[PDB]
Design a protein around this ligand. Structure first.
Ligand code: HEM
Ligand code: HEM
Ligand code: THG
Ligand code: THG
Ligand code: HAR
Ligand code: HAR
Lengths: 361, 361
């Protein structure tokens, strides 16, 4: 009833906007009639290869919390709407890691899986990221942010070595199955980068490492009323995500005191700004390490400079800019970037990527 | 008409809330009747010494953009509602600088001047801060943020030496005068701190300095419908205000490249994070310098820790916490503080301090 009404309204808005950008404004009338006939016949509609390719690109362009939006039009869209089995999903996810990694020269990619038909999912990915470390809790072992997913993987038969860097398996549920299935990640497929410093030799004693590619796999892509609940995407890392958050937060790896110890500074006084000096050296180390291994990474100053060119190009194209200031500012030296000194409209424009409820927890 | 209605409604709300906090809940009825008779007779009402003292304190407690709110109840309120002449205002402002500075052991203070009667001001302060540096523009000399006020002071007969650190004069307008008057600041009254580093001797070559006390003098204090347009206040500096903003911003003193030069690092690559390393050393230098001279200052980690205790105490007292995340987070290492990892309600609660239009410009 109301579901078929919402679907048609978002479709009219998308096709018109999409074809206007692609230079196919005359093809709107004939396509919208075919879509109306399809919604009445089946209860949904299927996007063309050109439609979802541009829809996923527009969705990136509309992502308020993303600083890397300058490269929106270079997104490599992999169409996997043909998947039917758990083996097909596994091979598609393995392929995504391989092609996106590209021996270090990271290609911004997205794999599109079959969308929701009548509100029910065809493929449901449980992983936050395709490549992520496990977390356990005695004392804290691994990534605390991965605790609930690790406990869910363990309830399914998976068991990790209990090191600080255990790779979580791929865990997803197919339509018709009550519970999900899991597959361990081949070590050859996952590129990891050991963290070293360019001047301080003792930094390697910390035995820190991180994976090369952030592949968010739990977000819903919405394109013209069609909900793609399973559509993993990736860009490359901004150094601060690893050195100022993943390895620095008290609720994550909490390495600042240990970093301060190896760089030869005291942790006695807040006034010595040891945390700040530790953050600078850890972040310098992350950028050096990824570069030395030939794995794509960007520092926060270059990323902000790239985002400035995006703001300029959006104005030149006539589109309104939307952004979330609280997320666009880097967690290290935000006032040294232009982002800090201006405001952004936090309006949600469709197509976009959205948060969806976690099946575990 | 509507002005006498707004005044009575804010007065009822304030007196009830104020006396409930002071343990004088029975005295509300008798005081509110006297206020009703006063609004009908004159068109306004006069606060008691206890009323505005607590009103200025509550106003600090409600300041969303302030991280130093833990010390709200220790505010030293100076009542100068007795001022009539320009000499009286000058002596009150000189007294404020002296008593607030307190030979370096800064006392959080506020001087209350006569409020607006029928929408018109009795005393109008033009200075953003009582102690502030001039700005001119060839090339950039001084503080760019002070350009318009400097040009307004010059149009009145004032002339500075054109150094990077010229002290602006006190500039204010009395009721009945079309234009403001100015008074040069006595050098003995203004404490300035030369910036040096604890380990790097070459830092003094930059010849950087800053004043000791930030006395905001252009904000309106609103207490129970009564608008105190002239009520200068001060706390002490948080190091980041000087080292990460005043001396670091591109639109302010823009010293990062020069700091990078004296600390021996290259400004070639964004990936070396020279800006971040420069910020850490400049900020370490600011904290050391103020401490060495015996001038009160707080680092961002200690200030955030103090603000956490404020959040706890507000909950313990039963009051709702209001805050502006965009301003509460320090511009250096925000993710190393608790402020970054939580949300705040940005609702405006009265009594408060507000922005008012600049008479110049
Ligand atoms: C070109 C490389 C890219 C860079 C440098 C970049 C960088 C970032 C950064 C720094 C964040 C914040 C991360 C955090 O704080 O957790 C972010 C968020 C986000 N990015 Fe990008 N990004 C890139 C590519 C992509 C791509 C390829 C897409 C989509 C097709 C995308 C979609 C988003 C979304 C939706 C968020 C929000 C995630 C959330 O809410 O947790 N990004 N990105
Ligand atoms: C105890 C020492 C104090 C410290 C450490 C402190 C610190 C701060 C900081 C770091 C800011 C942001 C400054 C900026 O970014 O420009 C701020 C803003 C503010 N503070 Fe406090 N503060 C203190 C005392 C006071 C006092 C005594 C009052 C009021 C009676 C007050 C009222 C405010 C207000 C209204 C703002 C906003 C100013 C604006 O919007 O420009 N502060 N404070
Ligand atoms: N890159 C990046 N930036 C981040 C986070 C991140 O993981 N990555 N995580 C965030 C930590 N947690 C929050 C969550 C919500 C809010 C928040 O909501 N703040 C304003 C919102 C103001 C507004 O826009 O309306 C407020 O109301 O207080 C602030 C910090 C902050 N910024
Ligand atoms: N200490 C401190 N913090 C600051 C500034 C400061 O001088 N001092 N100056 C600020 C620089 N300029 C702005 C002004 C407004 C906004 C702003 O408005 N941001 C959100 C507001 C979200 C919200 O709360 O609704 C937005 O809509 O984009 C952001 C930066 C930022 N933070
Ligand atoms: N850089 C990108 N997208 O390309 N980042 C996404 C979120 C990743 C998450 N912050 C992490 O550290 O794993
Ligand atoms: N620390 C306080 N209030 O006590 N600061 C107020 C604003 C001062 C302004 N940021 C400056 O640097 O001059």
């Amino acid at each position: 009833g109301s579901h078929m009404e919402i679907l048609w309204n978002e479709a009219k808005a998308f096709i018109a906007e999409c074809y206007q950008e692609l230079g196919k404004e005359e093809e709107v009338k004939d396509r919208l009639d075919s879509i109306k006939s399809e919604i009445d016949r089946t209860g949904s509609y299927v996007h063309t290869k050109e439609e979802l390719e541009h829809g996923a690109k527009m969705a990136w362009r509309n992502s308020n919390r993303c600083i890397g939006r300058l490269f929106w039009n270079s997104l490599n869209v992999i169409d996997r709407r043909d998947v039917r089995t758990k083996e097909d999903v596994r091979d598609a996810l393995f392929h995504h890691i391989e092609t996106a990694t590209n021996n270090g020269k990271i290609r911004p990619s997205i794999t599109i899986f079959p969308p929701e038909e009548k509100g029910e999912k065809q493929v449901e990915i449980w992983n936050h990221q395709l490549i992520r470390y496990a977390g356990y809790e005695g004392e804290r072992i691994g990534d605390p942010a991965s605790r609930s997913l690790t406990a869910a993987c363990e309830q399914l038969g998976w068991r990790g070595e209990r090191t600080d860097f255990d790779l979580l398996p791929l865990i997803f549920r197919m339509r018709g199955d009550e519970q999900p299935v899991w597959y361990e990640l081949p070590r050859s497929l996952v590129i990891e980068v050991p963290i070293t410093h360019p001047d301080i030799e003792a930094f390697s004693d910390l035995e820190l490492k991180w994976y090369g590619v952030p592949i968010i796999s739990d977000m819903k892509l919405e394109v013209g009323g069609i909900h793609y609940n399973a559509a993993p995407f990736n860009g490359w890392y901004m150094g601060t995500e690893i050195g100022a958050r993943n390895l620095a937060d008290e609720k994550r790896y909490d390495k600042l005191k240990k970093v301060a110890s190896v760089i030869g500074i005291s942790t006695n006084y807040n006034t010595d700004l040891w945390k700040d000096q530790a953050l600078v050296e850890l972040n310098k180390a992350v950028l050096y390490s990824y570069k030395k291994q030939g794995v794509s990474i960007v520092d926060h100053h270059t990323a902000a400079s790239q985002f400035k060119r995006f703001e300029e190009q959006e104005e030149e194209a006539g589109r309104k800019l939307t952004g979330d200031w609280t997320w666009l500012i880097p967690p290290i030296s935000p006032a040294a970037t232009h982002i800090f000194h201006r405001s952004y409209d936090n309006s949600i424009v469709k197509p976009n990527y959205f948060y969806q409820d976690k099946p575990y927890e």
